[PDB]
Amino acid sequence: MKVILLEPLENLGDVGQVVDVKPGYARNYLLPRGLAVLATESNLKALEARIRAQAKRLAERKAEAERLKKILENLTLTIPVRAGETKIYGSVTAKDIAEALSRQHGVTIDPKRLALEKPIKELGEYVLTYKPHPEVPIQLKVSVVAQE
Amino acid sequence: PKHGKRYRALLEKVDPNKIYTIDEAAHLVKELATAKFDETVEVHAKLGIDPRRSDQNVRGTVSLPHGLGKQVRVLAIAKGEKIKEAEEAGADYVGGEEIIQKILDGWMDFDAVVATPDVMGAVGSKLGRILGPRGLLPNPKAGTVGFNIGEIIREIKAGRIEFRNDKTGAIHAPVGKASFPPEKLADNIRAFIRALEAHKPEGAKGTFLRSVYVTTTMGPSVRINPHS
Amino acid sequence: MKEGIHPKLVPARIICGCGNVIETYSTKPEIYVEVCSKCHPFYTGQQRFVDTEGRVERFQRRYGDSYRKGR
RNA sequence: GGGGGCCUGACUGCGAGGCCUGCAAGCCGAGCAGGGGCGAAAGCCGGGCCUAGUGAACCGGUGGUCCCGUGUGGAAGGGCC
RNA sequence: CCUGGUGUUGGCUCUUGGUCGCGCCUGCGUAGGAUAGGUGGGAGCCUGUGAACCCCCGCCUCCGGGUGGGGGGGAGGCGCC
RNA sequence: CGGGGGGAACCUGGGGAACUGAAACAUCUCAGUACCCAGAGGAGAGGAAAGAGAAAUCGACUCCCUGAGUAGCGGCGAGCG
RNA sequence: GCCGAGGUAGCUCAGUUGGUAGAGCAUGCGACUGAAAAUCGCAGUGUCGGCGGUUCGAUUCCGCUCCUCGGCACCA
């Protein structure tokens, strides 16, 4: 009984597999309902279809990632700060970096992620690890200084 | 995960997970145990038979090459001639209707019997009700009765071994002296293989040659393949 | 006919009966049952689209439903 | 028929030729071969002192044999004793 | 008609039996230090208790005692015979 | 658009029986016949080989003669074949 | 015919190393029984259907044999 699962991983744990739930059993008892289907070249393939698909999807993001990680991790990140010769009257929030690099220089990266506990505003420049894609991190050299 | 037998050395030496084979055997057994007085390995094992009908209560032999001189002894029972031939050939205990008499009285030292047909009846009956089934009345079917007593006691001493499945189907015997050449151990091994395979009673019903063990007196133990 | 099969007939005949064995194990026949009989399967249902039935026949069934199930 | 010795023919292959038979049965046997046993040996022994202790054919068993096998090598099954 | 198997006749679940694989563990007839289940090899084994003296404990019952241990330890014991 | 309703006999399938024989009669037998039905025709039926057969060939299907009444089928019997 | 089962002293039950046998009830002798029964004590008392057998040694272990019982299939 090639029970191909949509919402299953045992219980409703979706598209996790395909198992044997005996005749009718599996049939009208667990999947008629509608939590999966049975083999068929149509199905087996279908799986293969969306699987391959995600493969390309993920590989892909990996790629746009690489393009920007490279361009960026290479380039220097400079920014005009406002104050004395340490923390600025204001603060440097990684987001601040965000709009900064983003449209001031070209490439936009979401605020959210990056490595910034307390805004840093000690003025001068720091280079840190701000993760950009899953296990492909983007660390960068952000020199920031009083715009005097 | 720590037991009680310093022998643990030899113990680790062995790794019963494999029944391996005859020769590799000879080798590793030798290598295995030369404790106080170099090894005197032995093979012990059992067959898929049964006690009830004695059609399987086998025993016998097969010289299986290589010299000898000690083990479960015997009585040569016959007449002067045999005294000479069997006695010198290889007979610890030597007599006949004479030794039989002696026995009836109280003297005797022989579980194994070799009575020739010249006092065959003499011993069989005079001592029948003497030796009793402790395995002593020469019975024509156990390398125990016949013409060449000289020959049987002879090899007994020259290079012997015998069969005798104990209580529930096991035999015990030697097939390849201590450190003695591995190949040699292999030879007597297989030799017994056959001897046995032959004695195999027609009343077997399944996997006959069962637990095939080669082990040492006081030493390791593991099965072997009476095959390659 | 109002009782065939749907996916291929099964409403059918049969002549039966018997004897006694022993045969190639000590004896000849043992025969005396000129009798006649019936012979058949089952019935079940599912849905076209929010209204339906099934009817059919056991096996050929399982196959079938799977099939028109494909649509 | 009563007693003792040793022994298996209370044998296979087979029998010419007759009693009685309507069929079938059933009953009689010298004699030839191997082959033994009885006795030294002349000759007896192919169950008993004889006439009653009996059943076709089938179907199926078994111990042989070692003829048949369904394109052929085997085998199930298998033909005759 | 009643009646095992079997197909539609699906989920969860408490549970108990046989049989093998294996580790453990058991073996009390009377003389027998001594509760020998056989049959083998077959005069030694061990020092990881440095030990057989003792300690209590885990265990097994036909009083005894067999067994696995924590410990306490200071050439010793048991096998051999 | 089509059917349907008929038709002596032939056709296909559908379901499908006692006599009588086996001097009884239960397997067996009349037989897949009589007979009820549906349906196609002018004839339907079969009809281009998971065929035949054993030599190294045959070569669609149907109908006739021959093939044997042998191969064979069985209270191996009546018979059927 | 097959399998499961019972068979030992007048009645009936008891053992798996076998390797040593009765036991409860009726039978004989003796206290109690002033009668009785019943009570106790004792005795007597035996092939574990048969046979051999493995088996030292097994009666309960092996194989076959009697009468019995239960439930299948044998004669076509």
Curated annotation (Swiss-Prot), chain A:
GO BP term, pick one: translation
Gene Ontology CC, one term: ribosome
UniProt keywords, alphabetically: Ribonucleoprotein, Ribosomal protein, RNA-binding, rRNA-binding
SUPFAM superfamilies attached to this UniProt entry: L9 N-domain-like, Ribosomal protein L9 C-domain
Alphabetized GO MF terms: rRNA binding; structural constituent of ribosome
InterPro entries: Ribosomal_bL9, Ribosomal_bL9/RNase_H1_N, Ribosomal_bL9_bac/chp, Ribosomal_bL9_C, Ribosomal_bL9_C_sf, Ribosomal_bL9_N, Ribosomal_bL9_N_sf
Summary of the function given for this chain in its UniProt record: Binds to the 23S rRNA.
Family: Belongs to the bacterial ribosomal protein bL9 family.
HAMAP family the record matches: Ribosomal_bL9
Name the record gives this protein: Large ribosomal subunit protein bL9
Organism for this UniProt entry: Thermus thermophilus
Lineage of producing organism: Bacteria, Thermotogati, Deinococcota, Deinococci, Thermales
From Swiss-Prot, chain B:
Encoding gene (name): rplA
GO cellular component, one term: large ribosomal subunit
Highest taxon, organism lineage: Bacteria
Subunit relationships: Part of the 50S ribosomal subunit.
GO-annotated molecular function: rRNA binding; structural constituent of ribosome; tRNA binding
Family listed: Belongs to the universal ribosomal protein uL1 family.
GO BP: regulation of translation; translation
The protein's name: Large ribosomal subunit protein uL1
Organism expressing this protein natively: Thermus thermophilus
UniProtKB/Swiss-Prot annotation, chain C:
GO cellular component, one term: ribosome
Cofactor binding, note field: Binds 1 zinc ion per subunit.
Name of protein: Large ribosomal subunit protein bL31
Residues where Zn(2+) binds: 16, 18, 36, 39
Function: Binds the 23S rRNA.
Highest taxon of the lineage: Bacteria
Keywords carried by this UniProt record: Metal-binding, Ribonucleoprotein, Ribosomal protein, RNA-binding, rRNA-binding, Zinc
SUPFAM superfamilies in the cross-refs: L28p-like
UniProt-listed NCBIfam families: L31, PRK00019.1, PRK00528.1
Cofactor requirement: Zn(2+)
GO biological process: translation
Family: Belongs to the bacterial ribosomal protein bL31 family. Type A subfamily.
HAMAP family according to UniProt: Ribosomal_bL31_1 (MF_00501)
Subunit structure: Part of the 50S ribosomal subunit.
Alphabetized Pfam families for the sequence: Ribosomal_L31
Gene Ontology MF terms in the entry: metal ion binding; rRNA binding; structural constituent of ribosome
Taxon lineage: Bacteria, Thermotogati, Deinococcota, Deinococci, Thermales
